[PDB]
Design a protein around this ligand. Sequence first.
Ligand SMILES: [Ca+2]
Ligand SMILES: [Ca+2]
Ligand SMILES: [Ca+2]
Length: 71
Amino acid sequence: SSYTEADPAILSRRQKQIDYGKNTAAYERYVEMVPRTRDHPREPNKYGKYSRRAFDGLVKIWRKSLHIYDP
RNA sequence: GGCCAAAGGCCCUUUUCAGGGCCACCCC
Ligand SMILES: [Ca+2]
Ligand SMILES: [Ca+2]
Ligand SMILES: [Ca+2]
């Protein structure tokens, strides 16, 4: 119950997926939230012990959730 | 420590609110 991912391979791939998400306009238009809840869209911990599907699963849900953030 | 979200095990891509691959489970 305490793990930090070391594999540079895994961390890059995961960073990329995250970087993608921040590069969206929805994330830009998320200057309207003070660190908040879990009902919000929070980027997955890249350092978390996660399975491949698990992390990808989270990321999918992350990006979708983002889209609540622009008309 | 535990519990939850996510999660079949991995793998590719800016088709990325997305598309795909291998294996496994299923239906034998
Ligand atoms: Ca679940
Ligand atoms: Ca599932
Ligand atoms: Ca399946």
